[PDB]
Symmetry: D2
Subunit: 316 residues, 4 copies
């Protein structure tokens, strides 16, 4: 029976009225929270022609619900090439990008899946809206995600700190669980698909091996790769290590489309002491030549991400 319910939905407000502007941010977030709820459930009854469906049906969901916080100008889905411009009598200051369900049909192993989202603010005036607003990296206002695992944590990283929230299934609300997360600067785990790329790896090959074979008397870093992008970013935020998905030969390297996958993921890391590096540049400071641009990432604890550029540059 527990009186100080600290919901996302008023927490964002407590820093956001201590700043004026327009609500919008919260109306956006809140609406995103309903759809996330919505997905957590149909996935918790997971599987009670056939090809895909769940996910595309939920991209459906994320859209209108995002398009009804009167707070969006334009959306960019993994599922849709082109930005879908939000309507006149529904537009508001903001631009979002989202992979609505990273893992949609790899559920079968009751593995972790997620909704990654990245929010921008349209601002550059009468243009009117159109796809171009999908242009910076290091300027997303608000970014985070939602892992439906044993639970449904929605981690929300903004402007000034990383917060984790938990779905409380008793009352339909995301509740402040940890207030300002910072990353285990080193001491670690490392994660990569060592089948697929082991032969195909480059400078990073010796990287793994001094992370296996200790150039030392150090005990070694443990392997841990779930194969889902959200599950694996989160276990790096929390217990701390280095996650890396390059994918060598064709090189806007891995599946991870920059802009709604590795870019939320980069800012949420960035705000907790996280380096997010292409290996040559910094993932936040890259302008999107095109909105669906696949582009790699190494992220994690700073003294670990940093040992990897010391690999990469005295090398390539």
């Amino acid at each position: 029976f527990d009186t100080n319910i600290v919901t996302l939905t008023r927490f964002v407000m407590e820093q956001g009225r201590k700043a004026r502007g327009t609500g919008e941010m919260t109306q956006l977030l809140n609406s995103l929270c309903t759809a996330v709820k919505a997905i957590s459930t149909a996935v918790r009854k997971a599987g009670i022609d056939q090809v895909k469906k769940l996910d595309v049906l939920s991209n459906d969901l994320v859209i209108n619900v995002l398009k009804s916080s009167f707070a969006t100008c334009v959306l960019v889905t993994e599922e849709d090439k082109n930005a879908i411009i939000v309507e006149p009598e529904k537009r508001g200051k903001y631009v979002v990008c989202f992979d609505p369900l990273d893992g949609s049909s790899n559920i079968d192993c009751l593995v972790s899946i997620g909704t990654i989202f990245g929010i921008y603010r349209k601002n550059s005036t009468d243009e009117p809206s159109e796809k171009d607003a999908l242009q910076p990296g290091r300027n997303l206002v608000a970014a985070g995600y939602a892992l439906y695992g044993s639970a449904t944590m929605l981690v929300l990283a903004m402007v000034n700190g990383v917060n984790c929230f938990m779905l409380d299934p008793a009352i339909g609300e995301f509740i402040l669980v940890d207030r300002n997360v910072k990353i285990k600067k080193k001491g670690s785990i490392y994660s990569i698909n060592e089948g697929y790329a082991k032969e195909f790896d480059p400078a990073i090959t010796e990287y793994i091996q001094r992370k296996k074979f200790p150039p030392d008397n150090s005990a070694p870093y443990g392997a841990r790769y779930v194969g889902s992008m959200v599950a694996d970013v989160h276990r790096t935020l929390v217990y701390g290590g280095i996650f890396m998905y390059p994918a060598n030969k064709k090189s806007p390297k891995g599946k991870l489309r920059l802009l709604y996958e590795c870019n939320p993921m980069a800012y949420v890391m960035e705000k907790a002491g996280g380096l997010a590096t292409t290996g040559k540049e910094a993932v936040l400071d890259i302008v999107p030549t095109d909105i669906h641009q696949r582009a790699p990432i190494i992220l994690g604890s700073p003294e670990d991400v940093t040992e990897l550029l010391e690999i990469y540059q005295k090398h390539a």
Copy 2:
């Protein structure tokens, strides 16, 4: 798997951005929705020194949660005599009044209980806030309630129409179930505690008896009184009849404190074709001499409420 989730929390927005002002209304409503959720549950696990508690604990709840939509100037609880003035760096345009749990310890018979709420807008300037804003009747902007019965319907009557919403327990959201409710103008049920007041009744005595003994060849009106104010207003909104609680001898007659009980209840009725009459005046058009003023009500279908003033005035 069901894509057009029409939640309260954006519905109010769809008429409210089609009007400008400031969000506030929705932030208030939305926050009220969390606390209502919160109560529905602890009541659904009802009863897993001892005197009362549940309710007072929830008045606790309604307050801060109302005091964190930055949208209140002053609150008036059944549970608190005096308006509690909301804080400086938390005040916003609005005044609320609420019986946070009409029926708190009559639960035992798993009967219906509720949260009645009435919202006003402070407007009358630098005064600063203080208890006086609890002054009209027929000017509440927004009013309705929440019955936790077989379900948890939150019926929200505003300015331009009565809406009913249902708690969907799968996703933590109140969903538009009926869009613009209007009252069965007659054809009826009638409800009063015919024990307690039967001897004590006045003009209204013959009223009941021509509602029992048909001054006719009409079949008679059925008895139906649950003894909870919300359960009984709702069954009158829906199947239609007349509810009446006078309580004759001491006459700000019944327990129902005007201002947060019979006044929400009056506007929600009013907006669906509902007469809400003291029996002499009209319950909405009465100014609160004091904020805890008990004061009676007859409400219901118009050709029935109206047959009761035809009782009352060619009589008293």
Copy 3:
């Protein structure tokens, strides 16, 4: 998370072990609780053939759930034409008469509704086993009702006591929350349909006004009528009064069916030390002759029913 989690099952299983029985009671009740649960969810979101459906679905769900426990052999239902005789393969010794959703279409005004059941034992050799196995008067071995109010309460009565379990939705188990439960001598509220029955009430009139404005002098009775058998009876089990539906035209009076509305409820009332008569015959001692026999009922606290009977003596 307490681990001495006393589910209905463990209650029912301890008791079948004392009695040295075969385990059918336990699986029957277990089956039945699977339906009570899904029906309790059906209703929590109703409003979100087509003239009437939810009753039927409930009745198919309860026959199905009961046939699968091999533990039953005749099933008598509010809905089916005649008895359902269970296939030799899924048989067992019990006989269940049940109403699947009492008050089924009076559920939008959101009041409590429920499922009622009574369980006989088939004692002759073959027949094979048809509806004549519902002759029995008070030879129930178990009876009870499931109440779908703001919590789902299953009050169960058997040879030793009435016990009250509550559905904890955090785990989907009816938990034992209240024990043995006796009703209290006299202490009242009189629950009756005050309209029509007032145009037909004979000895009941005297009783109504003897309890309205008292002759042994002082303090009057309250009235309360929900309009739903399960509801008006359950309130009567917890608070004290008297309940009556004798209503005259429909002259085996009552809508209340003898096998599956009145006898279970009489049983429970009686096991809790409260009585129930016809005003002439005891309800439980009446033999059946029709399985769809309507029978008049009046029940509740002792003193109170005896008062009505003292009056039915020198009267009509």
Copy 4:
């Protein structure tokens, strides 16, 4: 609301009726599912003695739940010192070895975790009945695990097949969602802790690189390691690969306890037409000598484990 609601129970109850048994299996599994459910809720909101608590609570909850079914007699647990010998009053014929929360404190990174169990039958006369009743190798009558991921999945294996049920939280019942289930010949992902085991991998090395960059020429393997037995094994039951935790120092190698981690899981794998060896001994044929015996395991698709064995031949 479909009424042929096939719960785990009805599955287990049909099967005990074929086998002409006593009904203990059904109540044991029934008890066990009451804990699987509350544990599944414990975890859905963790984050909302004190160094470690949730494991223990789970283990007390599962012993308690198992003792109440009179159906058990020795209980062996990851946590308790020695066997728990059930009081003569609550006894029955089964023997359960179980781990209550595998991966208990690696649950904030929110990954799947679970409860694993194996069920023996006590076949000697008295003793009275102590831990020696856990000699048996593959003499399980039932084994399975409960997986607490984005849905709670209970995979159960017994004499005839592996079957998969899913917890429907709309009713609190494990429902039968998938049947008989065989694993598929070869088809892979190799799941292994690639770090340390790489510094100790003997024949496994050859195998790792024979499956990294292939010699019979073409298409490589993926790696996947969650770091949780239940999780890495369940994924292996649905998709195809190989799983290995042989790890050398800890030389009855394995953290994986023989009675209640490796033998259940071997059983299930084997019943689904996949194998599990030590690389030397079959896991299921190994006799115990300690109830806390650690044993090395490698398991999963046939071809794949046979490949590893072909190599363990001419090797080390």
